Design a protein around this ligand. Sequence first.
Ligand code: HEM
Ligand code: HEM
Ligand SMILES: [Mg+2]
Ligand SMILES: [Mg+2]
Lengths: 234, 235
Amino acid sequence: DFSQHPWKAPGPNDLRSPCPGLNTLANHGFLPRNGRNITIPMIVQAGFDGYNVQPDILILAAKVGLLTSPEPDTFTLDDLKLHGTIEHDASLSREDFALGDNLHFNEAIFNTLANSNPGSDVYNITSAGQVLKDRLADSLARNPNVTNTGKEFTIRTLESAFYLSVMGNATTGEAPKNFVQIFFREERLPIEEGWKRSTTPITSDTLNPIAGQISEASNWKPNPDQCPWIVLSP
Amino acid sequence: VDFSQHPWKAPGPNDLRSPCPGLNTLANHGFLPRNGRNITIPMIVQAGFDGYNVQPDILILAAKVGLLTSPEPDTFTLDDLKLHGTIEHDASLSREDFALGDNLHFNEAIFNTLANSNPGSDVYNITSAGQVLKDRLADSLARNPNVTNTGKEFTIRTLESAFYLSVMGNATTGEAPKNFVQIFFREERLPIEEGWKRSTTPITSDTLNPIAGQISEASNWKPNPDQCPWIVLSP
Ligand code: HEM
Ligand code: HEM
Ligand SMILES: [Mg+2]
Ligand SMILES: [Mg+2]
């Protein structure tokens, strides 16, 4: 029932993340609107309620997210900005940590995703891959501190599988462009615009094939002498 | 803390245990569930404080990484913690390498090195701890073609050695009566009847790290050249 879950703009003391997925859930009150005191069970519930995303992938992501917080079993959405845990260079809608603000939505960065799949009414696996190339190529040219290993790349293919899957079709990875634009720009569920919570459950068995196809369409190579790492503590 | 309400009891076949004498001992006295199940990060902080006077910072971090070994949302079992390459590492003090046998259970043959350390002394110390780290790594290098030896394992090994010296011994000097350390590993018991008292000084990152750092210097250690440190993220 989305009627109990109206969108509201985050106010002054309301903490947000670099993740449109969680920010959208907070802005609809599926997570605390203040973005504080989030447990792994609250993530599993908000993800299932909002998007029909199943626990498997949410538990893993939330456990890694926890490492960004000094708290025993909670994090704030602001904690999740910690560079090198999940937050990575070559984001779709955020600047690289080394160049500026790795937290907030940035229209200038988002422009690439916005303008992708020209002449189509959807983003798809092909356009998602092209955006991954363009964003990485940007960070490699302007960021001498770029981190581009297997870890960041896997997360990038998964995050791109996420926007295609939760705003669009979880099997084909096609998503109406206006749904994806609203998701990123307003961190809002485009309910009035016709968006429905996925009827098909979003699992690692649906996300992985989509992430894999985005990967193939990205024509990716790692930086040669970089070791994959999860920063373990703030 | 009242240890009278926390009696040692031999773990049964019902009861899940880890490769960690620290947690296993806490479970054996009922500071953690004796069945070794349904352990939250808050239960770890409390059991660590109650049993050993260990402060939350280092326990929170260790427990959050331990969680990665579990498919459950916010709990692990002690048996989950055996997952090779999360925390569990080659060149353990009392367990065999995953590649060569059992990386879970106490092994007397492996423990022999630590047991015979600091010969002609009644205590184990930073010097003997360092020598045991060299000897155990050298053993794994000789016998384990698949040995993983990077900054991550080494840091964890210096910390785990700082832990046995600190919780069974003196948290400032890193000296520990040998029979305390030997019961801790062999029986996963607080040696209360044998005179062990919970540390009066709080065991923190600021007490552990200096000890781990000195153990490191006494270990004369080098990483394997072409290995990347990594935390295995899921079973
Ligand atoms: C619930 C479904 C989820 C969806 C649909 C989702 C979606 C996304 C998307 C599309 C991005 C890419 C943003 C960009 O590159 O500009 C992203 C980034 C991120 N997400 Fe999620 N997410 C979800 C769950 C989670 C969870 C559970 C966590 C952590 C607990 C998380 C943490 C992050 C972080 C830290 C980033 C920053 C990565 C970066 O761009 O550098 N997300 N998410
Ligand atoms: C609370 C005080 C703690 C103490 C005194 C302690 C002590 C130790 C010691 C001495 C070892 C080395 C055993 C050996 O090499 O044979 C060890 C190993 C281990 N501990 Fe802990 N520990 C503590 C807390 C924790 C916590 C909170 C976790 C995870 C939640 C944990 C997980 C492990 C694991 C997985 C190993 C296996 C490492 C290996 O030898 O391969 N311990 N612990
Ligand atoms: Mg980023
Ligand atoms: Mg081991």
